[PDB]
């Protein structure tokens, strides 16, 4: 008997494809998301800084009423 190494009928394919799924996000939308979250941070920044200025004026009033 002869027991060489042939392939059995022909093997399957091996892909030579360039895999580029191009994800993605449509970057003008990413500009929109970044500017939106950035402006939301600005509004929160405004609100907290002005409430803390109210409290810091209360600290001023404490030292003024405590001075003499």
């Amino acid at each position: 008997v002869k027991q060489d190494m042939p392939p059995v009928g022909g093997y399957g394919p091996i892909d030579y494809k360039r895999n580029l799924p191009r994800r993605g996000l449509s970057g003008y939308s990413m500009f929109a998301v970044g500017i939106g979250a950035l402006l939301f941070g600005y509004w929160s920044m405004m609100r907290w800084n002005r409430e803390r200025r109210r409290l810091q004026i209360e600290d001023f009033e404490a030292r003024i009423a405590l001075m003499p």
């Binding site: 091996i14 892909d15 030579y16 494809k17 360039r18 895999n19 580029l20």
Partner: protein, 54 residues
């Protein structure tokens, strides 16, 4: 099969990697006349102009 996958993944990691393109584009210009008179053979001749393949 596994190596076709891994070479697609190497083209994904490098290869339109912007910083490696910024590293190596401007260098390596070779005229086909210089590629034939400077005794070049193979991948230089492939990459610069003339169709040549033994």
């Amino acid at each position: 099969k596994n190596f076709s996958l891994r070479i697609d993944e190497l083209e994904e990691m490098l290869t339109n990697n912007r910083i490696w393109r910024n590293r190596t584009v401007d260098i390596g210009v070779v005229t086909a006349e210089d590629a034939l008179n400077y005794g070049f053979s193979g991948v230089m001749l492939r990459g610069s102009g003339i169709q040549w393949d033994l």
